[PDB]
Design goal:
4 copies of one chain form a homotetramer.
Chain A: E1 3-8, H1 12-21, E2 27-33, H2 38-46, E3 47-48, E4 52-53, E5 58-61, E6 64-67, E7 70-75, E8 92-95, H3 103-106, E9 117-120, E10 129-130, E11 146-148, H4 152-168, E12 170-180, E13 208-211, E14 229-236, E15 242-250, H5 256-265, E16 271-274, E17 290-293, E18 298-302, E19 305-314, H6 318-333
Parallel strand pairs in A: 1-2, 1-8, 2-7, 8-9, 9-11, 10-11, 12-14, 16-17
Antiparallel strand pairs in A: 3-4, 5-6, 6-7, 12-15, 13-14, 15-19, 17-19, 18-19
Helix pairs in contact in A: 1-6, 4-6
The complex binds magnesium ion (2 copies).
Chain lengths: ~325, ~325, ~325, ~325
């Protein structure tokens, strides 16, 4: 009855998931798998530009890390079918490389002396349930092999959109995310894999429009909103920290006080509520998947018709990470 | 038949207006008035962080500047009633200090051996017509004393909103501007005049929500949209360059091609049209008041109802400056 | 040790934060002219130093911080604050009253010691904790905790002098931008043509004083050091380079070993190849970086380069608190 | 002078731009493996260097630039490009083939001279225009235009040597971040632990080579200079500080006057207190800043600090074009 976790892909998400797990009661990481030099991985675990110094000590040892006194095995196997997760008692694997984001690619972690459950850090395609914790994790019964923890933006959008739907009914809506730059943008103008003419531009020196998927795909999490939402992003020069705006039409007339009260009533460990006039640096490292900001709510009535704007913050890094760890722990406990 | 211009307030807007005027055929600045040390003003005219080096040479002389060989008188009088604009043949004054943004304060430039017309770089209050050039400058007949060149955001919003209105009819709409930080924000966290808890934060290190006025005040420029638009801003870490999004409902059903075609048909020297996937640095220093970006248009149809998103870029500095100079030249020529 | 803070700016607020985690020290009174609601918001939320560790509420006459009440007043003259009503022994003068005129805090029901957060002038001792705090005997009224740059430079320069003897040296600080720079190009009080420029969009040369004033802290180095700064677009976090000539021939290994031997709570030592974000919020006044040492030997002559990191905010703040606590106890 | 560009990266694109404004020079062929539509977009729109001055259209087999056709190919081996079909005399090799193996461009219907945009190795002369371009006689096949940092350092270091004699010196470049740094923390090819860090959110120490390699351009300074860099968050624009000892006693005024006397099209002189954004797009290879000079005299010994700005992009590009034109004419 301790959740032993394996991480495949020790990038930003995998490293932050490891950090977050150190502060969660019933979870621990007993194996890391990644092709990168362990000295590079240990250094990036110790020092994070936006998320601060590691809370403790990390040493490179033969075959892995010593982290806060405890040994963690680190391997460098290319294929999930060759990873002996069971040797370290791993029950559930966080698949966060980005290369196995499907059910038939990610299920390879489950084999003889492998793992028993898999959570992918991506939408994941067909036959893979998409879980935003505390919004729709009740769709898990335990029989699943591979599930998805959705995207970082989905984990921000979903509880806000669900509260609008549950209380007032959504007709349609357009999302605008004002988003930190990410690793798929160039640091200086140049060709990038995929050939997107905007991600080719210096991400820390520009406002960069970019496409999104969370709004169009919201139906995977909230079925009654399937096809009702669309959106786009503006990437801007902060290294993490983002904000999701939704402009929508509803089935009921509302006021600002009732919209804000509905969000406060929906608050929990995943969906926070604030009336403080915060800015993006204030949500770096938070453990909410989504933090509704009541100061930004607009209910615009013009000749009897209403447009409603609701806004939620998220650390696109740690907010998503905290939600992944909740889903990892819950999925592992329901077997 | 040369427009002799006086500038009161040699801040960013006044300096850029001077720069822009050097490249406009029938206009010239013969007097500058500002309380700042002329050596500071000359240095800031020569070197601009976002708008580049001055196109030519500037020298501090006794009583003013020598700019590209020609002498420009620079004085330091506190009150408009004490400025002898007529001594330098000044017909029209750009009032850009921010302290005389009303008709009874700005009309003091008009006195014996003063100026004859005034353009304020601000909304300006009652009894002051608000002019966005090439959107509503036909409301000027010549009898006016003091007029307003509107705000920088109004000059971006107005032609886009007018084209939606003229072609399709607007029911209502919500504006989001993703905006460069400005001089009313702190460089590092601290108390600021006015006590706004968000402008108190480090403007180049945060996404900062902020209130706007352009959408609510659009009726001063487009009367048939009075009260139909509202909005807000997200200030982000670029030093200039901004983008205005409008999400609206219309009186007619539309498609993306028809919205984009309507914008292209409305293009002129003030309102540009582009289908290139540009980013914010690409519009630094442009002379359009507004540059519609067809790549960002969304027409979302859900169960017969449409939400329409249209997006226009603007250099909140030089875009606004170029519009001010157009209005200055036109106002002066119609006497 | 009950502390009073005059001037709840960045330094004052961070000193309040740092004191919450140091035993035997607490702040019982804050004096500042700003609206307490603005002061409370900025204490709760800090762009570079993170959210406040705990709760802050505005109450009548002050704040409730983590359950404890803190008095907040807006008296404009130090002679008017009754520091003793709240048991305040020592005042952190951080408004920016840097004369021995900081002694107005010290009167009947006022404080009994004062620490200025700046160079303090002629008859004010300048203390960099764990470098020269032995010059305090306890009889002083007003002392100075030096500048943030001095607290970084001093232990590094002292270790060079104690081990090898410094002939002369030039400092280059690659420094975060600060509140004396404009956010966008424009006139600024004082009229410096370079601080008038957008501080987060430029490399901005700026003058310094820490190297020229080092004699106040290390007498043997008086008039031996000079330097300047390059302000660059990070909101906090800085690094001090010193190129020096010495009286002995040295090697990189020997210099690095001397630095490691001098390490303590104020002067840290690292061999990790870190960057500026990694020192945000540290409690060292100075963190020597052995990876950047250069000992260049040409025709028997040597130029020696030593480099130390500091959070120009929290490194300096931690040093102030150390000096506050120590001064109050003697 | 008809120029061929192999490698249409930042340096290649800016060289194309700069050539549009220099008479007697034009680019008639570009070779690069990237999609021409991506290359055309990046030529049109540049984050730091502004919009392209004119029009660019993708046509079959190349671009139409300001009415003139420019051939664009994607041949992966220099031996395969028929440079002479487009009248190309000299090739700017900017892909990053830095051996005398750049001579594969030179064959029957290929080019007849090559300039590498990097240090070129053993048997390749290294030219900084207006510092040592007299070492070219015309018989060379493959030459090097040195590095961007070298083109800044060289005229400043040469003027010190010619006027006063340099004993030794240490360089500190406060440098814009570059494309070899990560935008966010992560593994990078090569495994440098510091270039793995977010380049626009950090002060990042990094190694240099220009000072150690200065002998290739100024023989008298071989083995006399060393240095390092601090990468900081501006997208372009850099500044080079040199702390040196000299063979003569000097003063600030004398040093500044020597720098002014050495000024030309490559090496500029200013007394204006500028900042980094003010040198974006300049055509000087190096802009000496007299406001930052220090001459520190202690017990008869002197440390001399001289500082020069450069746009690590356009300063270097302008120098390459000068060397391209001059090499082609002799
Ligand atoms: Mg932090
Ligand atoms: Mg420019």
């Amino acid at each position: 009855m301790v959740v032993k976790v394996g991480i495949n892909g020790f990038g930003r998400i995998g490293r932050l998931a490891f950090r977050r797990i150190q502060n969660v009661e019933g979870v621990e990481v007993t194996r890391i798998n990644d092709l990168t030099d362990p000295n590079m991985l240990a250094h990036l675990l110790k020092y994070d530009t936006t998320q601060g110094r590691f809370d403790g000590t990390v040493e490179v040892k033969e075959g892995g890390f010593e982290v806060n006194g405890q040994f963690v095995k680190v391997s460098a196997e290319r294929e999930p079918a060759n990873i002996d997760w069971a040797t370290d008692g791993v029950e559930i694997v966080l698949e966060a490389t980005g290369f196995f984001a499907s059910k038939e690619k990610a299920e390879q972690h489950i084999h003889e002396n492998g793992a028993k459950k898999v959570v992918i850090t991506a939408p994941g395609g067909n036959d893979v349930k998409t879980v935003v914790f505390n919004t729709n994790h009740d769709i898990l019964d335990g029989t699943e092999t591979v599930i998805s923890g959705a995207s970082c933006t989905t984990n921000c959008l979903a509880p806000m959109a669900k509260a609008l739907q549950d209380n007032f009914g959504v007709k349609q809506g357009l999302m605008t995310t004002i988003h930190a730059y990410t690793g798929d943008q160039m640091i200086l103008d140049g060709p990038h894999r995929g050939g997107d003419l905007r991600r080719a531009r210096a991400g820390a020196a520009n406002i960069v429009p970019n496409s999104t998927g969370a709004a169009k795909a919201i139906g995977l999490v909230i079925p009654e909103l399937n096809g009702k939402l669309d959106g786009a992003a503006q990437r801007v020069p902060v290294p993490t920290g983002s904000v999701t705006e939704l402009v929508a039409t509803l089935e009921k007339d509302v006021t600002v006080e009732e919209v804000n009260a509905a969000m406060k009533a929906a608050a929990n460990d995943s969906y926070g509520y604030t009336e403080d006039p915060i800015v993006s640096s204030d949500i770096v490292g938070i453990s909410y998947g989504s933090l509704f900001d009541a100061t930004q709510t607009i209910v615009q009535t013009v000749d009897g018709n209403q447009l409603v704007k609701v806004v939620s913050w998220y650390d696109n890094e740690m907010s998503y990470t905290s939600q992944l760890v909740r889903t990892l722990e819950y999925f592992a406990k329901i077997a």
